Ligand binder design. Structure first.
Ligand SMILES: C[S@@+](CC[C@H](N)C(=O)[O-])C[C@H]1O[C@@H](n2cnc3c(N)ncnc32)[C@H](O)[C@@H]1O
Ligand SMILES: [Zn+2]
Ligand SMILES: [Zn+2]
Length: 874
């Protein structure tokens, strides 16, 4: 107890629980955190500080003791109070916050306070093991208190030695010095101040229970004198009549994005100009240029007022939760949330995934891609001829409620596509655009980005669905509809394709691929495929026009050149004035209708995988340039083995399965990375990991087992981890729903489980329990899956054993013996250990109790729905 600070510490440790709680607040400045805490709990992301820290930092910033500017690095950001505060500061350009996550430590909170798009917070970082990087401002609020000041000195010195590695001559800084009164800390502080300047300043918002002082860059003052003055002040507050803490107002951190000047995109305004001006004239009443727009790699054209769309909410399907009670304690089931489709939820995803640039492929890569696409269009075009689809074909499609992409119908003029298509006024609008397309002009073909409502383990932000105007969708169908209409990507035509295949018969295809001689089976996922589509890809896909003539070639060239290679997009954004619709543009990336996307993603993925196959086989040595001899080699390889190399793949969209000639493919990565098709959750140059068991190969969110029947017949069945299936079934799409609509949704899940996951003990039990607890005549409602391969044969009131027989026996091409199954008892399960491996609770007492007492839970749901006609399926 030699220093004044140590004398304070002894006195502080001698206090009792109540005297300490009283002393802690005596005469200090305090922010009333109640409105922010409440607002944040309601899900409010604007205005509120995530902690007391924003006010603490503001106290220093307002006095010019620290001037945050340029790149700000915040060490131990916690919830992000200092980071979010800095985000709204004029001279700040970028905020990087690093914090240790996990138990006992605060996790970063997502906020939409002013300049949030310039702030990136990172959890799971021990800053003591982080490589220092360039910054203009270094903030640090690390220092855990302890009754032992020697322990505190050690902790403080560890922080001081850390901050030193991140400091240079021009660095602005605000560093917490937890224990500034210990002699070892004074000594290190003196050394640090001699080199970097600054001084130790006490914040009046600090509690008396701490002697923390901050090392701020713009202050001046003697360390010993400053520290002893705070010890004296802190010792005096012991015996001073409890003065209440002076209440300060909490900080208003505003709202909205910020523009820092990065604009990396040159639009072709001769191509996109008419489209922008039409939007601009239609919204003249609210049109403005927002100088704080967040777009970096997308050209910004202006904004207009719009009414907010999408939801952040998520409801539990009670019918399913009541009938799957052992899963209430499994986090991988319960932490399943719905995606945030609101303008903030969307903007967060845009920032992270969509506002990115893909590097231009090298000269050899470009040659490889052009040669392969030329060859591949000629292959697909052998037994098929490109044609124009018709208005009557399109009309038939909308009438029959068939598969069209995401479409907008002009809510004023027409409420539905059916209402529109049946009106001659709609086709007059189509003709005006058609005639403009015939003269290389585009005026209406603009995409409406809307958040995709998905179930994920979050809550996570939303992916974008690119809606087209029904007229823009017709012009696309007329020109490129033949790819889907005539099945160019069917397995018979494209040998890699799986177009028109139900999700249940995809395992039979993976089995036929495994029958080939070769290496392991590779199933690498691309990190955001649609954003990784270059202008090279778009120009190589356009080459299908070389197989077209006259009016059809001019119309398809308009879709490619004007609408795909020069996209105009409308996206929502939250602002201090309310929600706005932004007009933005991008030349590269995938932006087409959902159906044409599928085909062009299959084509380009078929082409990228053949190139990855040529690389592994050494058909070309370098991507920098392709020699005249390597061109002849690539063309001969394609002409000689191209078709059998296509037969080694199952290519859905961006989703692929490849059984190469050998495992040289695992490390054949230079062309893949250069094409921009970078693999997900793996270091760029780390070799791929394949599978030596086809039943373990992931494809279209499933793996597939071989299932031996009682009669010896073999089924190949779709399977997934059981928690993904239950977790998804237990979440209802949206908010505000009647029990009728919920029970019909759970019934769609139950019947999906009966047709596809019958081999899963817990799922066949839970599915029969839902169908018993839901009135038998009730029609199943809403989508169970987004899957383009989902057949939805479970969306019926027809006997599920009759449907099972039709799918698995009658219509199954890999089922030679057409003998129907007389009962569900005849249908098998996976082996008990196979089932347990894929997430089954079979063999647990809790699951046994659940199964034994399932009639109690069936009756509980029956009571909540009310006495109706029920059939027992148990
Ligand atoms: C006092 S809080 C910061 C308050 C923050 N400035 C705010 O306004 O929200 C310090 C944070 O540092 C974190 N932390 C502690 N040791 C760390 C380490 N080695 N690396 C990174 N963060 C760490 C703690 O989890 C804690 O949330
Ligand atoms: Zn157009
Ligand atoms: Zn399985």
């Amino acid at each position: 107890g030699e220093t004044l600070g140590e004398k304070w510490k002894n006195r502080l440790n001698a206090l009792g629980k109540s005297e300490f709680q009283i002393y802690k607040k005596s005469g200090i400045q305090e922010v009333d955190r109640t409105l922010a805490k409440e607002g944040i709990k309601r899900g409010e992301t604007d205005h509120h500080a995530v902690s007391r820290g924003s006010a603490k930092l503001r106290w220093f910033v307002e006095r010019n003791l620290v001037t945050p500017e340029g790149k700000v690095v915040d060490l131990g950001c916690g919830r992000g109070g200092w980071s979010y505060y800095c985000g709204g500061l004029k001279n700040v350009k970028e905020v990087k916050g690093l914090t240790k996550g996990g138990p006992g430590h605060e996790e970063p909170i997502p906020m939409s306070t002013y300049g949030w798009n310039l702030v990136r917070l990172q959890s799971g970082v021990d800053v003591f093991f982080t490589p220092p990087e360039k910054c203009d401002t270094l903030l640090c609020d690390i220092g855990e208190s302890s009754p032992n000041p020697t322990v505190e000195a050690g902790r403080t010195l560890r922080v001081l030695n850390l901050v030193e590695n991140w400091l240079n001559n021009n660095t602005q800084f605000c560093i917490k010095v937890l224990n500034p009164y210990m002699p070892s800390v004074i000594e290190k502080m003196e050394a640090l101040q001699r080199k970097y300047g600054g001084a130790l300043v006490r914040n009046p918002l600090s509690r008396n229970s701490t002697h923390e002082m901050y090392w701020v860059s713009n202050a001046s003052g003697n360390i010993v004198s400053s520290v002893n003055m705070i010890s004296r002040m802190l010792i005096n507050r012991f015996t001073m009549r409890h003065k209440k803490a002076t209440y300060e107002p909490d900080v208003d951190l505003g709202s909205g994005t910020r523009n820092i000047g990065i604009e990396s995109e040159t639009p072709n305004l001769d191509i996109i100009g008419k489209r922008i001006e039409k939007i601009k004239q239609e919204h003249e009443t609210s049109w403005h240029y927002d100088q704080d727009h967040p777009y970096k790699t997308w050209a910004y054209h202006g904004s207009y007022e719009t009414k907010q769309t999408g939801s952040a909410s998520s409801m539990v399907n009670g019918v399913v939760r009541l009938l799957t009670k052992p899963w209430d304690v499994i986090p991988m089931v319960t932490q399943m949330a719905m995606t945030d489709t609101t303008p903030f939820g969307q903007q967060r995803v845009f920032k992270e995934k969509v506002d990115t640039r893909t590097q231009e492929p090298k000269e050899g890569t470009k040659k490889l891609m052009k040669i392969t696409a030329e060859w591949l269009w000629k292959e697909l075009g052998k037994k098929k001829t490109p044609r124009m689809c018709t208005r009557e074909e399109f009309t038939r499609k909308v009438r029959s409620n068939a598969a069209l992409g995401a479409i907008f119908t002009d809510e004023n003029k027409w409420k539905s596509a059916r209402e529109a298509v049946e009106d001659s006024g709609f086709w007059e609008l189509v003709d005006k655009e058609r005639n403009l397309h015939l003269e290389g002009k585009c005026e209406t073909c603009v995409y409406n980005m809307m958040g995709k409502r998905e179930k994920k383990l979050g809550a996570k932000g939303s992916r974008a669905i690119w809606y087209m105007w029904l007229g823009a969708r017709f012009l696309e169908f007329e020109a490129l509809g033949f790819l889907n209409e005539d099945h160019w990507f069917s397995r018979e035509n494209s040998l890699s394709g799986v177009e028109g295949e139900g999700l249940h018969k995809l395992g039979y295809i993976l089995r036929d691929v495994s029958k080939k001689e070769g290496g392991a089976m590779y199933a690498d996922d691309t990190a955001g495929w649609d954003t990784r589509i270059t202008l090279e890809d778009l120009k190589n896909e356009e080459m299908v026009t070389n197989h077209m003539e006259g009016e059809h070639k001019k119309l398809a060239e308009a879709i490619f050149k004007l609408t795909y290679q020069n996209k105009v997009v409308r996206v929502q954004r939250p602002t201090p004035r309310g929600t706005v619709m932004d007009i933005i543009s991008r030349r590269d990336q995938r932006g087409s209708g959902q159906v044409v996307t599928y085909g062009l993603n299959t084509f380009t993925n078929m082409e990228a995988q053949l190139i990855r196959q040529m690389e592994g086989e050494g058909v070309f040595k370098s991507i920098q340039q392709l020699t005249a001899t390597e061109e002849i080699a690539v063309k001969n390889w394609l002409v000689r083995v191209g078709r059998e190399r296509l037969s080694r793949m199952a290519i859905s969209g961006d989703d692929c399965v490849v059984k190469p000639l050998d495992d040289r493919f695992a490390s054949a990565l230079t062309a893949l990375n250069d094409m921009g098709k970078v693999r997900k959750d793996i270091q760029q140059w780390e070799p791929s990991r394949g599978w030596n068991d086809w039943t373990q190969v992931p494809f279209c969110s499933h793996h597939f087992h071989e299932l031996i029947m009682k009669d010896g017949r073999v089924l190949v069945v779709p399977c997934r981890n059981q928690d993904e299936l239950i977790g998804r079934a237990r979440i209802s799409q949206g908010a505000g729903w009647s029990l009728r609509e919920t029970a019909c949704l759970g019934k769609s899940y139950a019947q999906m489980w009966s047709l596809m996951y019958f081999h899963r003990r817990d799922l066949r039990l839970a599915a029969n329990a839902i169908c018993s607890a839901v009135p038998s005549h009730w029609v199943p409602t809403s989508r169970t899956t987004w899957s383009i391969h989902a057949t939805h044969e479970w969306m019926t009131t027809e006997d599920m054993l009759t449907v099972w027989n039709r799918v698995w026996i009658q219509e199954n091409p890999w089922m030679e013996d057409k003998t129907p199954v007389e009962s569900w008892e005849e249908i098998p399960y996976l082996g008990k250990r196979e089932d347990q491996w894929c997430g089954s609770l079979i063999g647990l007492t809790s699951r046994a109790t659940w199964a034994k007492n399932i009639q109690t839970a069936i009756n509980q749901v029956r009571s909540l729905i009310g006495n109706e006609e029920y059939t027992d399926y148990m």
